[PDB]
Design a protein around this ligand. Structure first.
Ligand SMILES: NC(=O)c1ccc[n+]([C@@H]2O[C@H](COP(=O)([O-])OP(=O)(O)OC[C@H]3O[C@@H](n4cnc5c(N)ncnc54)[C@H](O)[C@@H]3O)[C@@H](O)[C@H]2O)c1
Lengths: 364, 366
């Protein structure tokens, strides 16, 4: 028996580099009164070796041995042959995406387990410390710029050289949510001249506070036309475009057309952070870099957080710790679900074998 | 005529070009005409039409070699040497000391050759110093390469998912490349540390935000003694245990690079550290380095030993290098004339000129 033990399995999803705990989060989990079993090699792709987990106080296990834990933390939802190894009474925490996965939901319910979906955390301010989506979008903004710099053939950073002045790169960020603000931030660190647009005017003051230009137009379309004319104008002026625009519950809006890209200066780069939802850019090939005929690199990776695995695992694993701080107020290795707390109600999609998703309507 | 020819570089995998549209404008103001071989700027993102806009003529195949002046990045390959016609002035990297066969073959064609690697490393020549331009780019690019391979934030920050410390960066060697690396790592918010055996650079390193590392301890003899070398190795072993990124730049042309970071030191680093070895072309300052590749150690260190860092910033390298050439030419062509005077009283021209009218004139006097 393994009450109060958390099992951290190796991620089985193709090309996943992240892990749901790091040596550091493990020290934190033990402070909450749990024990931790990590499956051998779980952290290798994220640069956390077996020995560092053992040094943090975890036990390395080999088999399905990790599944004999009372609690399982993962990045991705379990596959069929994992689901069958979940014992009754187990609490599983991972990304689930219940709306897009009704059969997964039924198979978990049948194991008589509790499930909290890290995608279903309500976006209220007190829940920010558990919000994995913000965590990942933040990494992705940062990484977007790291990829852009990697692919770009000029200095990002302005500079006085004996062989001439070099101007700074000009970067347009589309969407100044969590990812777009991270991208602004990264680009600023490299000394770029940054411009941003968002439809939500309330971000104006954060964007300008970062030394970036908040772009203005000349809603509900024909607002789109003035937005597209802005992006067409900007596309001929800038070197780098980072596009991050999603609308909850929809495909990704085409904001950057083939004609906009075609007008850009050769050697320009586009990082399309909405690629997994189809991309903001018409040239985007999800999963790849596409190079246009005029010499523009369109970056469409769908795994920017997995291209920064150590940092992603750290922050995600902190998200899970912070969720467990809610569930284990006494620090005694025991989980208590409180449906009066709207945060816990949001996140809990199965409770001991009963589907509890969707949560009652909330005001975010 | 006074025509300058810019060939496409044919050394396998070369991405740089000896002129950009911007430098072609400048070439013309000096009284020259310019032909660019089609496709020459492509890999550096300058297509034919961008060269024509600038006032250059596009030509195909070997017509480019029928110019009074040839500007290249790399030395002519074997089937390019024959294409040099007598009285032509060639300007490129040559590395005479390390290629006497090349030097003989060029001499027969009865050309004048100027090796960009032979520019006297002095005050009045820094606007012409291609080795400096290329090192500066390489230092900056090293850190882009480090960031690409690194699995953590470079930049400290505070998220609701917690506080992330900055990356810690050690730069070995604070010449041109090392300082460029210090600057890019500091821009990214790292804690940057730097060692150089020359104490004069301390204030330079410090002014850019970096800690100047001191040893637990004439100058030439001090730096070669067993005692100093044991103390320097000791410093590196200790830093390797605590930093995330090491950039090594200790490289002398034609000499094999000193092994400053041993297998043992790398084996002590935190998993996911990155080493960028800018001495890889001469064997590397790190014992794990595999020149031309990234090598991953058993303990999860990425040892980056690409030898072509300026060609992984091709647009920038072509722009600056082409500007160095423009500047050589301003010095060869004082009356903005279309005509070149190889004035041997100017020490910089004396230094760069390694063949003249078929006579090997390298090496220049002290
Ligand atoms: N309370 C908090 O402390 C907090 C913190 C972070 C996020 N959140 C919440 O999470 C939710 C989503 O997070 P997000 O802000 O990263 O958004 P997001 O990821 O859905 O999209 C990124 C940005 O794209 C923008 N966008 C959409 N269409 C656009 C268009 N056509 N042109 C330009 N921009 C466009 C959005 O307005 C948004 O700012 C929001 O409800 C937010 O309030 C809350």
């Amino acid at each position: 028996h393994h009450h109060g033990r958390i099992g951290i399995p190796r991620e089985r999803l193709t090309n996943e580099t992240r892990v749901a705990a790091t040596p550091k989060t493990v020290e934190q989990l033990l402070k909450l009164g749990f024990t931790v079993a990590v499956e051998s090699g779980a952290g290798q792709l994220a640069s956390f070796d077996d020995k560092a987990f053992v040094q943090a106080g975890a036990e390395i296990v080999e088999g399905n041995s990790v599944w004999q834990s009372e609690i399982i933390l993962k990045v991705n939802a379990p596959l069929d042959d994992e689901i069958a190894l979940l014992n009754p009474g187990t609490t599983l925490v991972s990304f689930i995406w219940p709306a897009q996965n009704p059969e997964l939901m039924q198979k978990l319910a049948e194991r008589n387990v509790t499930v909290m979906a890290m995608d279903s955390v309500p976006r209220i301010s007190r829940a920010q410390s558990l919000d994995a989506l913000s965590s990942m979008a933040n990494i992705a903004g940062y990484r977007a710029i790291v990829e852009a710099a990697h692919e770009f053939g000029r200095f990002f950073t302005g500079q006085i050289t004996a062989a001439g002045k070099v101007p700074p790169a000009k970067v347009m960020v589309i969407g100044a949510g969590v990812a777009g603000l991270a991208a602004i931030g990264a680009a600023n660190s490299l000394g770029a001249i940054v411009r941003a647009f968002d439809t939500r005017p309330e971000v104006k003051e954060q964007v300008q506070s970062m030394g970036a230009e908040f772009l203005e137009l000349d809603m509900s379309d024909a607002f789109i036309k003035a937005e597209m004319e802005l992006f067409a104008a900007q596309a001929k002026e800038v070197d780098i475009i980072v596009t991050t625009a999603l609308i909850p519950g929809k495909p990704a809006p085409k904001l950057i057309t083939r004609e906009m890209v075609d007008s850009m200066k050769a050697g320009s780069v586009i990082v399309d952070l909405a690629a997994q939802n189809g991309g903001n850019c018409e040239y985007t090939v999800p999963g790849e870099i596409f190079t246009t005929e005029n010499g523009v690199k369109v970056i469409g990776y769908t795994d920017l957080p997995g291209r920064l695995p150590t940092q992603s695992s750290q922050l995600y694993g902190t998200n899970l710790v912070n969720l467990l701080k809610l569930l284990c107020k006494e620090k005694d290795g025991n989980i208590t679900v409180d449906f009066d707390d709207v945060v816990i109600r949001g996140v809990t999609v199965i409770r001991a074998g009963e589907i509890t998703w969707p949560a009652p309507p909330i005001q975010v």
